[PDB]
Design a protein around this ligand. Structure first.
Ligand SMILES: NC(=O)c1ccc[n+]([C@@H]2O[C@H](COP(=O)([O-])OP(=O)(O)OC[C@H]3O[C@@H](n4cnc5c(N)ncnc54)[C@H](O)[C@@H]3O)[C@@H](O)[C@H]2O)c1
Ligand SMILES: NC(=O)c1ccc[n+]([C@@H]2O[C@H](COP(=O)([O-])OP(=O)(O)OC[C@H]3O[C@@H](n4cnc5c(N)ncnc54)[C@H](O)[C@@H]3O)[C@@H](O)[C@H]2O)c1
Ligand SMILES: NC(=O)c1ccc[n+]([C@@H]2O[C@H](COP(=O)([O-])OP(=O)(O)OC[C@H]3O[C@@H](n4cnc5c(N)ncnc54)[C@H](O)[C@@H]3O)[C@@H](O)[C@H]2O)c1
Ligand SMILES: NC(=O)c1ccc[n+]([C@@H]2O[C@H](COP(=O)([O-])OP(=O)(O)OC[C@H]3O[C@@H](n4cnc5c(N)ncnc54)[C@H](O)[C@@H]3O)[C@@H](O)[C@H]2O)c1
Lengths: 338, 21, 338, 342, 338, 69
């Protein structure tokens, strides 16, 4: 039978995930039955349907009352409790929680869902502490069905890690630097206002905002051979969605740009199909809105110097592509349910 | 709603600000 | 002696007001001695100095420790408590509180400052209920020294009311419609996210966002003859500062566009000098950053039809221009302390 | 062109409007009376095929493959011949059997300028902008049935005129409009410089994506061309804001019959369901500009913003996709000319 | 004794250079006496005064008539001829032409100024052909007084080359990859419109736009040791000014981040003083508007992996900082005139 | 030409009103304002800036586009 799902946090990722599942429901093993969020079901149905980035939702009818959101006649129960220990997961028969609030990423925080009655939690963010991290297409087949709390890593890790795994198995990655020129996210401030991060405090649509990131170090969680050999930064720019990863690697096997592209192209056609897309087109960020891949290599930007310094550039829809991977990991967990 | 009472307890939160300008 | 001032809410208006007073500290009866904010003194000193809109503060040096912000050798004591009843207004000898949090706009919440030890409070927003509203240059002389809680209206009311008062005393305003093409403010979400207002919920830098506003009816508060005769809306657009008011008035005494400009120019040179600026230049919004006037009439856009339908367009720096009026009103209350 | 045969159409100016119109026709090609067979543009076919498929506003074109060689753009195997000459007198309209030219360059809006297509061999010209001089101007839903086949040069007005005129028509027939002021809060367009740079207009010279930019507009006076009873009774301005598409008209009217906002909304709603179906859409939803990307209506009335003062001062607010909505009307006027070609 | 200067192309660089000269006019050996541009003088006096990026010019009054622009009494003759061979350089006694139109960067294009009567041309862009390229602070002392056509390279070259030189002499740069997250320029399109570059054709304020950077070739010109050892791309993002360069170098002498920052800091205080600024503050792109340094190293972003892979990140005002260096090169050519 | 364009419009209305002799002098009086309006636009063409001539010759250039939004 089906695995019953509740979404905790109906934000950008929570709502993108809902749309991903609504489009892929015909061949799904999951059934989204409940939503917990700050907002009431009516506000959330409006935001689910009308999206500044994804446009008006086309595939299904979306209405609501005071109790439920109706996505094509299918009633999704709604609750608004910001303490997950109080959430009615036992009564609703919840099996899997999509933890997308961004504030329950530790085991102590995520386990509050388990106390509420849930059986497993999928954190749509890096986990804090000793939480199994997975990147679909890189290490998700190492998933232990006995784990109760897992992390799908971050969107940037999901873009960088597949490219890294292909380059490492082909040329042997010794060190690696990354910079994601990244669309701004809700964590930043519209106008200059207080923030724990003095740079994120600054007006997001007005500035190039450097910020630290663990996405490059996090690749070592899913590729253990490369633990400690990657580092990076992030530059938030005034775009609302779609980001791009710039990766400069020091490799053992000398190579050229033509071979680097050919290896990634072949992997994108075989092992990394649906995860890496290979593009020789001269496109910009808006052209990758809604792309389903985790990384779209921009082949005409590949550069190699001296044989051993490799530069690759990869696009990713940090909202939609990552949400597809959240859905992918959730279906994988449902296929191996124990 | 619980959403309406949230903005009663947190009128300065991002989900609750109304600047009449 | 000098009236001792505390700022509640160190946001866009709170910090703009601070920088307004710093540049006029030599000729002032006010002394800013305290700040209450949800953030710490070190973060707030950083934001005070480094401003995306105003630039890096150049006049005096700005530093901070755990307890104070230092501006030009002047110590500003800081505290962090969201409940104004707990603030040390008695111990600090606070005379006038600048209420710029946007949260305590009613006499109920604003009186908590008075319970804490403060003697008067100036609300940097429209008030809720029995709070006297003042617009400098329109009715601020009617201020009674015994009033303990006052409102400085909104930035749009401060732009519209001086224009309305001039037009009303020359031609007789019977009815009037307003639309402010407004820069986005901090009450709008950066990306599509939860909000009790479904339009403020949408990505601010990606949309034209209509919202309701009482700024046009609040003109009836300061020009009591026109109570119930003015209404309007707002359109928030992806600019971070500076806005423009579009006012279409139905007029008694027939006129033409040339005479309307002569009247407002005449007023800007005499009775309304410093409040209204008359401009025949073909400027855009960026050119009005830092302008000290409440309204800058774009004389090129004035038009009249049938003698009775008048349209005038006025610029205003909603952050800096309004903050100059907050200072002017506070300076007026210090001169009439009684 | 015999009945059943397609009116052969050439696009002059393959810019925002020219490519929006092309994608409009491509999605309606099933039951169309037009066949787009030619393109003249200052650019080449390979560059223009790329821009036609990859559009930052409309997204990637999904329906049919888009290909180009040195001579043609292929939109689903359908070949569109291409040429690059800034002088329309030199264009091969005779050789290509061109019946109707879509004048979308923004520079040939006078009769003398647009007639250069007729000299080249084209039979009729549809200007995708206000005409200069007395060029017959049409707004679908308002007066396009007054078109007469004896006219060789017509104008489809502007995007703002196509949004304001249907509303003004409904309000005038319901309450009698005596005067009217308009402001369009408009997305920036290609006539504005990206950064502060040289321009004949000191305000279009300023950086478009970081400025609120006023410009004078004829769109309000242009309503008097399609509603002649209101000639000289309407005026307005424009404010360009940093959005790439979708605009909104704010209209304040002094009317004769006393009313309230509730009646103004019901009258507009009634027209949107009868005479103005497909031209005016009536919306009671709390939406923003991005939600109206791709809307086919010329005016989407935002009913929540309607207000009336003193019974005689009416304020209505209407959305419009200035690129896609206007191009749908260009196609609509072109289809109407094709149905009555003679 | 003064070097008579004419500006060809009164655009962003031409008008930034002009405002640079007006502020540094008291010590200059240059005298701006002529302008050629598409616009008339009255239009250019308006654009020179009112700048969306630099604000209203405040030092001197700016007026104009049919013939001249007047900047504080000082008259500047103006013409509008887009063919430089027709320009009145002999009639105006022009010694140095600041070639800033962007369309005369080849030797035959810039030599058209020589036929008109000018003695030397300074191209504010990378040259086409064997045109001697200089970056102030790196190789400008090698300037030969007999050369009649020189290039001041590009904005990214002027930011990256001083840091490359410092890192090369300290650690020995073997290879190096660069990416400049770059503000958009007038070369791009406001909305999708035809362009030589299919990516610069796409709406500038809506997209991240990968494109070429002049620093990929020009840095090897001013540091000849590293010819053919550096490469990279540009990422045009929706900001109107200020850019940041991300440089990942493969070095010979192993090191760590603290030592890399130490070497650049010492250079910024001695040999590279006024060219490289060392900053440990947590600022954003708006904070570097008007900064006079060619490069501002964001020290907190420096990182090293395995000793030999070094990542440095530096800010630059591509309009103002580059125009300051154009002025510096022009002052240097005046001091070594022959 | 705010006064000359309005007087040509009224001199044509005055021409149509009298005709609908005096009809001949009303048409001759109208043509004398159209001959002077050609004189005012011809002298404006002489003192046009090089920038203005550039926009006449390149109406599609970036410095010359006027879209009636
Ligand atoms: N948006 C991206 O680009 C992106 C990409 C990959 C991963 N992520 C990660 O996914 C997570 C979701 O981020 P987002 O972009 O959706 O931010 P968001 O602010 O859009 O979403 C947060 C939502 O959770 C709700 N919420 C917050 N606290 C809550 C509580 N205690 N109980 C119930 N609901 C609560 C909020 O109302 C909001 O609607 C973040 O941790 C982020 O790091 C984001
Ligand atoms: N920004 C404008 O254009 C403008 C113009 C005129 C009037 N106003 C009005 O002025 C007020 C200030 O708005 P703003 O634009 O500065 O918004 P803002 O978010 O920039 O300022 C709010 C500040 O107050 C602080 N704050 C919130 N709740 C608090 C509490 N309980 N205790 C202490 N501090 C608290 C926040 O930390 C924040 O720094 C609003 O009511 C607005 O309507 C704004
Ligand atoms: N974009 C809108 O919102 C909108 C809406 C309604 C009407 N209009 C009007 O439609 C017209 C087109 O506007 P647009 O937005 O497409 O401008 P645009 O600059 O995007 O398109 C102009 C196109 O015409 C080409 N062109 C210019 N001169 C030419 C010549 N002599 N010969 C051949 N081709 C030439 C250009 O290469 C460009 O591709 C304008 O007059 C505008 O006022 C625009
Ligand atoms: N803007 C930057 O960030 C930057 C930085 C470094 C170098 N540059 C280089 O400097 C040069 C100037 O760039 P910009 O950004 O100032 O461009 P711009 O378009 O802002 O300025 C160009 C000016 O030259 C004029 N012009 C064009 N062709 C002409 C001709 N034939 N005759 C006379 N005048 C003509 C134009 O009217 C315009 O005013 C470019 O080559 C650019 O590569 C730019």
């Amino acid at each position: 039978s089906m695995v019953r799902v509740a979404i905790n946090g109906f934000g950008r990722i929570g709502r993108n995930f809902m749309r991903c599942w609504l489009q892929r429901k015909a061949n799904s093993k999951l059934e989204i039955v409940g939503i917990n969020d700050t907002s009431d079901p009516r506000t959330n149905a409006h935001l689910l349907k009308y999206d500044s980035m994804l446009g008006i939702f086309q595939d299904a009818e979306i209405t609501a009352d005071d109790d439920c959101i109706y996505a094509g006649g299918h009633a999704v129960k709604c609750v608004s409790d910001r303490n997950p220990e109080n959430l009615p997961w036992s009564a609703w028969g919840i099996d899997l929680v999509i933890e997308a609030t961004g504030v329950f990423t530790s085991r102590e925080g995520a386990s509050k869902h388990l106390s509420a009655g849930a059986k497993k939690v999928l954190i749509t963010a890096p986990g804090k502490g000793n939480i199994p991290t997975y990147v679909v297409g890189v290490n998700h087949h190492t998933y232990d069905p006995s784990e109760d709390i897992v992390s799908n890593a971050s969107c940037t890790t999901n873009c960088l890690a597949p490219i890294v795994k292909v380059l490492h198995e082909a040329f042997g990655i010794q060190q690696g630097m990354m910079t994601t020129t990244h669309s701004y996210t809700g964590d930043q401030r519209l106008l200059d206002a207080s923030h724990r991060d003095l740079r994120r405090a600054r007006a997001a649509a007005m500035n190039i905002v450097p910020t630290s990131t663990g996405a490059a170090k996090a690749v070592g969680l899913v590729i253990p051979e490369l633990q400690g050999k990657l580092n990076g930064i992030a530059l938030r720019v005034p775009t609302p969605n779609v980001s791009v990863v710039d990766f400069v690697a020091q490799v053992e096997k000398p190579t050229i740009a033509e071979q680097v592209n050919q290896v990634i192209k072949e992997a994108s056609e075989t092992t990394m199909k649906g995860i890496i897309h290979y593009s020789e087109l001269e496109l910009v960020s808006s052209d990758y809105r809604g792309h389903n891949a985790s990384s779209i290599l921009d082949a005409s930007l590949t550069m190699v110097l001296g044989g051993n310094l490799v530069k690759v550039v990869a696009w990713y829809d940090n909202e939609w592509g990552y949400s597809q991977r959240v859905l992918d990991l959730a279906e994988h967990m449902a296929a191996h349910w124990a | 709603t619980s959403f309406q009472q949230y903005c009663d307890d947190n009128p300065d939160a991002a989900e609750c600000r109304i600047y009449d300008d």
